[PDB]
Ligand binder design. Structure first.
Ligand SMILES: [Zn+2]
Lengths: 142, 108, 50, 121, 86
RNA sequence: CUGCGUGAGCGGGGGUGGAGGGGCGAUAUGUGCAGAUCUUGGUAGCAGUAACAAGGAAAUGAUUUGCGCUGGACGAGG
RNA sequence: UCUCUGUUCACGGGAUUGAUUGGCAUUAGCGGCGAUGAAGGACGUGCAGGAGGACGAUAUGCGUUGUUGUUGUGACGGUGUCUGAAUUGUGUGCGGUGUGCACGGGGACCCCUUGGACUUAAGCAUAUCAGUAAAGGGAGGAGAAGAAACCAAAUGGGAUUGCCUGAGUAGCGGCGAGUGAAAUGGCAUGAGCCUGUGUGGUAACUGCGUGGCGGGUUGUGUUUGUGGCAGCAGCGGCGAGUGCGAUUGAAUUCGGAUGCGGAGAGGGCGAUGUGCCUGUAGGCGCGGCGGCUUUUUUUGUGAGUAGUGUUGCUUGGUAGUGCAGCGCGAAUGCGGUGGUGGAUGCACCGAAGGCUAAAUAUGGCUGAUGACCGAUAGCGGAUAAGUAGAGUGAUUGAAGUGUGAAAAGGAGGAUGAUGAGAAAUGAAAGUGAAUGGAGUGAAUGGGGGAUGUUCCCGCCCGUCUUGAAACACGGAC
C-alpha cells in the first residue's frame, strides 16, 4: 500500500498520500540534504534522518543554528534539536519542532548498523552511473 | 392545434432504454491494438483469408460485383488443388455455393 | 427477576461492563483532552430489550 | 525473549516440555498482577514466548509426515495434506483432458498437416 | 378503556433471541423467526429495498474471504513446507 | 460615510478583517423571490402572565412533642 | 421614569467570503465464496481501557523475507472459541462396505417457469400499459445462439451475434387510441467439427490395483510437452542541477547574479516556486501466471416423431406467425418449403441426436480522467452512520467540519504572561447601557420646504372576479 509513485496528478490523491501513508513512507518523505564537504565522499544527495545526527537550520528564527537531533516524530513530521527552545510561563524550557526539509546534514551517526546503509547506496549509484555512461557514449554514436 | 404533420413519437413504454458510448475515439484505438496483437501471434500467416468475387442478386443490383464468402470445390480442383489442402494455405472454401456461370467460374 | 436463563444472564453482564467513562490516565494525556465517552446508558431512560 | 531459531534445534518432545515451563511462570505472573506488583512488560513477553513455541511445534510435526509420504500422488494423500486452491479450481478438467481427440478423428487429419507460409504484398 | 388503561396489561413476551441472526424476532408459539426465516435452510427474502443493504456480504467481518483474495493474486501457493509433496 | 446613472446597478474614502481578487470578446447554464395553511433554522409580543410547589412545631435537632395510612412475602416486567 | 425615534459601545444568532484525507459522473481492465465447513450472528482478548477500529485461548497479534532503531512498518505464509447449509443428516453414483458427489451465500447483466394493476382511449368492457413489475427455479466471466428440411426470383446470394440504411414503411387495430417487422445494400468480427451399422487369422477397448480384479459381444475402441514460439501483470532499486541584498511574525514576493533539462506533471514546506524535500523523464534487476504448438484407412441411418381435427395462449403475420393439452397418427427412387384457401408445373433444400472461439450486455472492485457539488449542496452518511433513537413485528432512521506557523495558554472575578494577532470571519431579526430630540396624536409615505411637527395629497398587499379597503381567502418577524 505504498503510494509515493502514483501515476495520477490529481490534487486530492496527492495530499491523501502525504498525510496518511504508512510509517515506512513517512521516513523517506522526511529526507534531508547533505553538505558540500560531505557530498564529495559519498556521491549522492539527500539521505534520511535519525537521532544523533548533526544538522544546521536554514530560515526562520533559528536560522543559522547548529545542534544534534534529540528526537524525531516521523508521523507528524517534527524534529527536535538541542539548543532551540522557549521558556514557558513557569521558568521551564521546551524544545521547538522544526520541519525536516529545512535542515542540512553534517557529520551523521554511524553505530546501529548505519555505516552499511551508506555503503550500500554508494555502490548502487556508481553502478547506475555506468549504465548511463555506456548507453550515452554508445548513443553518442547514435 | 395548428396545421402540422401528425406526430408519431413512440415514448409510451416505461421499460424503454437509452444507450450511448461517450468516448468512441479511445474505443477505436483500443480495438486496433487488439488487431495488431493477433497479427504477430499468427506471425508468418496474414490473419485474413482470400475470398472470391461474386454478383449481387436482384435486378436493382445486377450490375455490381462484390467479395463473397468462399470458393467452391470445383474452382479449387481446376486450379490444381484439393479443398482440404486449400484451407491450410489461407483460402476460404464454401461448399454451399453452386456453379452456374462459366465466365465467373474463370475469374475465380 | 431472580429467575433468568443462562443466555439472558451473560448478555446482561456484557452490557453492564460497558457502561463506563474514559479512564483518567487517558484523559490526562496531551492529545486526549476534552474527551468523554458519550456512549452512556441510564436504566430509567433507555431500555436494553432483554 | 527466547528466539524461534533457538527452539528449532530441540525435538518434538523437548519443545512440548519447554512449553510447560512457560505455563508455570505465567501462573506466577498472574498472581503478582493481583497484588499490583507486576512490571509493565512482563506478562506480554511471556505470552508471546508461548506463541513462538507452538508454531515451531507444528513445523516439526509436519516434517515427520513429508517423509512418511514421499511418492504418493496428490489424489492419494490424506485430505488434510492436499492443496487448498478453490472449490472451483478443484472441480475443473485438466489441460490434458481438454485437448484430447478420438482416434478416428485424427486419422482424417493425417494427410493434411499444417503449413508455414508468408504472404508478401 | 381501550387507551391508557389497556397498556397496563402488556407484560407477556412472545419472542426470544434468534440463534441464526440475533434479533428479538423468533416467535416461540409459531417456531419461526420473522426476520431471517429460521429454521428454513434458506434465508428469507428481504421485505424492503433498504433491508437488502443492512445485512449482506461486507456488512460483517469477512474472516475467510479476505484471506482467499490475497491468495488468488499469487497463484495459490500454500505452506512452503508442504510444497514438496505437490 | 460619499460620487455617477431615468432605472436594473456601478465606483471612491475611514474603521474591521488576514488571503487572494478582477476588466473586455465568444461559449456553457441547477442564472435574479415578498407571498405557495411553502421547506429547514433562529427570534419577538403575549408575560414574569396561566399552571405547579411552599408538609405541625421546639436558637440547636442521633433528643422532646403533633399528624397520615397502606404494612410483609412469591411470580411477570426492570 | 414610561412610549416612539437619532448616535456610539456591548450582547444574541450563525448568514456571507475563503478552504476540504468527502461525494458524484464518464472511461479502461477484472468479476477471484462454500462439507478442505462459506456469508452472517453471539461472546471474549491490552500491566494500567469505555466507544470505534483491529484480533481469536498461538486473541490490542505469531513465523519467513525486505526496509529499519522506530508509537516501527511492507509483501507473503500459519492460527482462528461457540454458532450458522450446520449434517453422527437426507438423496444418490461406483463398488460390495469402502469411497465420492449434491445442499447454503450472491443474483446488476444471462437462460427457463409463472404473471398484475395504476395508466391511455378525455366515460368503458376488446385493445393499451405489457409478456413489462413483483414471485420462483438454474448458470458464468459473460450467457444464450450457431454451420440451411434458409433467403429468393438475378448473369443470383450463402452459419451465429452487434451497428447504420430500409422505416414509423409493408402490415395488425371498437381500421379508434394506438402498434409495428424483415430481406437486399454498407460496416465490425470471421471457423468449423463429433456421433448411433469399425476386425473375425481370435476386444484390436478401458475404471481400479501392482504379470491381476470390475465392466463389456443387448458392442468397448481415451499416447505424448521440465521443448518451443508469442504475450500479460507485479515487485525492487538508481535518478540532473544554488548563492547573496531589501520588506515580513515567517517568504515561493521585489532586486543583482549562477546552473540543469529525454526531467518546467502534480503535492508538502511559517505566504504567490525550474535548481529546499518528494517525486517526474529515462535506463537497469527480479518473480509469477497464461494462450498457440504433437493428428494410423474407415461406411450407410435419427418415430408415439412429423403431420392433422378440436380447445386455450401468443405474433406485424393478415384464412397458424409460433407454442401447448386431448384425440387420431405417416413415407423409402421418398420427404419438406416458395407472406390468401385449394390444384398442378418449375425452383430451392434434408427436420425430428451432440459440441463450437471472436465481434454484444452489465450492480460491484481496481486504475485513469472531469466546462460536476463545496457543509440546508454532494451519497442517508466530509466525525465512535445504517450509528443514536422509534416500533410486538415486517420495518424505520437523524443532527453535528475550522485556536495557532508553533502549546509557546488560558477556562469564578481582578491583576497579568505569551503571540504578528487573544485567536477563523461574524449579516439580519431582537435586546442591554449611556447620551441627544420628541410625545399623550395609531404609526408609516409622496409634493413643497427645513437641524422633529404646522399647508396639500394619501384606506393593505398578493389573488379569483362583472365588481375588493372589504363583515372574501393567504400573510407575527
Ligand atoms: Zn433470525
Amino acid at each position: 500500500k505504498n503510494l509515493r509513485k502514483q501515476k495520477t496528478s490529481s490534487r486530492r490523491k496527492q495530499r491523501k498520500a502525504h498525510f496518511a501513508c504508512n510509517d515506512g513512507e513517512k521516513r523517506i518523505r522526511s529526507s534531508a540534504r547533505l553538505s558540500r564537504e560531505l557530498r564529495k565522499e559519498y556521491g549522492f544527495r539527500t539521505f534520511p534522518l535519525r537521532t544523533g545526527d548533526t544538522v544546521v537550520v536554514k530560515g526562520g528564527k533559528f536560522d543559522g543554528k547548529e545542534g544534534v537531533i534529540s528526537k524525531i516524530n516521523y508521523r507528524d513530521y517534527k524534529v527536535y534539536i538541542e539548543g532551540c527552545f522557549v521558556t514557558k510561563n513557569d521558568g521551564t524550557n521546551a524544545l521547538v519542532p522544526i520541519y525536516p526539509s529545512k535542515l542540512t546534514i553534517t557529520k551523521f551517526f554511524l553505530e546501529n548498523g548505519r555505516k552499511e546503509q551508506l555503503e550500500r547506496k554508494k555502490r548502487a549509484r556508481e553502478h547506475g552511473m555506468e549504465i548511463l555512461r555506456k548507453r550515452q557514449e554508445e548513443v553518442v554514436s547514435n | 392545434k395548428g396545421n402540422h404533420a401528425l406526430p408519431n413519437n413512440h415514448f409510451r413504454k416505461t421499460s424503454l432504454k437509452i444507450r450511448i458510448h461517450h468516448d468512441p475515439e479511445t474505443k477505436a484505438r483500443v480495438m486496433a491494438e487488439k488487431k495488431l496483437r493477433k497479427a504477430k501471434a499468427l506471425f508468418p500467416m496474414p490473419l485474413k483469408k482470400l475470398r472470391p468475387i461474386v454478383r449481387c442478386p436482384t435486378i436493382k443490383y445486377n450490375r455490381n460485383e462484390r467479395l463473397g464468402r468462399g470458393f467452391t470445390a470445383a474452382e479449387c480442383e481446376k486450379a490444381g488443388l484439393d479443398y482440404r489442402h486449400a484451407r491450410r494455405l489461407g483460402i476460404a472454401v464454401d461448399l454451399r455455393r453452386r456453379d452456374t456461370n462459366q465466365e465467373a467460374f474463370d475469374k475465380n | 427477576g431472580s429467575r433468568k436463563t443462562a443466555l439472558v444472564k451473560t448478555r446482561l453482564m456484557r452490557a453492564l461492563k460497558r457502561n463506563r467513562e474514559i479512564p483518567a490516565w487517558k484523559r490526562m494525556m496531551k492529545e486526549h483532552k476534552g474527551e468523554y465517552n458519550r456512549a452512556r446508558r441510564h436504566w430509567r431512560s433507555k431500555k436494553l430489550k432483554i | 525473549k527466547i528466539e524461534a531459531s533457538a527452539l528449532r534445534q530441540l525435538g518434538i518432545k523437548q519443545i512440548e516440555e519447554r512449553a510447560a515451563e512457560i505455563k508455570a511462570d505465567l501462573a506466577a505472573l498472574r498472581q503478582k498482577k493481583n497484588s499490583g506488583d507486576v512490571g509493565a512488560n512482563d506478562i506480554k513477553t511471556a505470552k508471546k514466548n508461548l506463541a513462538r513455541a507452538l508454531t515451531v511445534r507444528r513445523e516439526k510435526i509436519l516434517e515427520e509426515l513429508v517423509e512418511a509420504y514421499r511418492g504418493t500422488p496428490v489424489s492419494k494423500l490424506p485430505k488434510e495434506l492436499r492443496p487448498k486452491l478453490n472449490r472451483s479450481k478443484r472441480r475443473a478438467l485438466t489441460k490434458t483432458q481438454l485437448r484430447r481427440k478420438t482416434r478416428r478423428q485424427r486419422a482424417r487429419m493425417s494427410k493434411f498437416p499444417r503449413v508455414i507460409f508468408a504472404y508478401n504484398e | 378503556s381501550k387507551g391508557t388503561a389497556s397498556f397496563g396489561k402488556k407484560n407477556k413476551r412472545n419472542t426470544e433471541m434468534c440463534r441464526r441472526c440475533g434479533r428479538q424476532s423468533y416467535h416461540k408459539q409459531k417456531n419461526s423467526c420473522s426476520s431471517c426465516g429460521y429454521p428454513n435452510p434458506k434465508m428469507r427474502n428481504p421485505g424492503s429495498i433498504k433491508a437488502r443493504r443492512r445485512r449482506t456480504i461486507g456488512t460483517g467481518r469477512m474472516r475467510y474471504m479476505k484471506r482467499e483474495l490475497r491468495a488468488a493474486k499469487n497463484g495459490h501457493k500454500g505452506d512452503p513446507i508442504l510444497r514438496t509433496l505437490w
